[PDB]
Amino acid sequence: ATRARAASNLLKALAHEGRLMIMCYLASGEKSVTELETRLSTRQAAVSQQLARLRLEGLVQSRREGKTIYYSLSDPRAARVVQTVYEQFCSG
Amino acid sequence: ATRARAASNLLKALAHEGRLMIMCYLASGEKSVTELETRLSTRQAAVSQQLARLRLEGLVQSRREGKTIYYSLSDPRAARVVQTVYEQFCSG
Structure with missing residues (x-):
């Protein structure tokens, strides 16, 4: 149950299309902000908040x-x- | 992005301590309702809704x-x- 609360909080951070897309891009290796924001359709202010949230969460x-x-x-x-x-x- | 919406919806279903605990118990194999509700601290009415949600989501x-x-x-x-x-x- 304690592990469940911790895991659930991670999943809440990931259960957001924009934050998840960032994490999926970082899952293949380090990326510059320039590359991330070029690949992402997100407006830059939104990406900025999303990066800050992922940082706060330690991710x-x-x-x-x-x-x-x-x-x-x-x-x-x-x-x-x-x-x-x-x-x-990605596997269909 | 399309895969991200689909994945994000799964993570929303999982980003709930009670639903996640059920899924973690089922991750080790089939379980009766009796076993699940014995293991879980959740009240039965809550477990019942959670099982129905996981069923609706196809999980x-x-x-x-x-x-x-x-x-x-x-x-x-x-x-x-x-x-x-x-x-x-579970790995610390």
């Missing part, structure tokens, strides 16, 4: 290389959950 | 053996997602 981290910001998955539990989601829902 | 099915009702996972995508959730959140 993504970021680093700087010059003027480029690179996000990557941090939480290994969420990484595997999202990888499973991505693979399962 | 569980059930069969009868005499007077026993056995539920099992039906959707293979959700099965693997839940198995990943269960394993990841």
Whole structure:
């Protein structure tokens, strides 16, 4: 039950089309903000809040290389959950 | 994006402590209602609605053996997602 509350909170963070899309893109490796926002249809202000939410939840981290910001998955539990989601829902 | 909407709807069904607990119990194999409701702390009326929701979402099915009702996972995508959730959140 305690593990269920923790897992349910992760799934609430992931149960959002925009946040899930970001996580699916990061599931294949580190991505710059430029790449993410080019790939995503989301307006930039929305992507910005979504990235901040995933950061708050401990699911993504970021680093700087010059003027480029690179996000990557941090939480290994969420990484595997999202990888499973991505693979399962892309397999028809 | 289309796969994201579908996946997000699954995660919304799973992002609920009670429904997730049911799914985690079914992730290890078919279970009678008696076993589920014995293991779960949930009041029976709540479990009943939760089972009906998981059925509506196509995630569980059930069969009868005499007077026993056995539920099992039906959707293979959700099965693997839940198995990943269960394993990841039980591994500390």
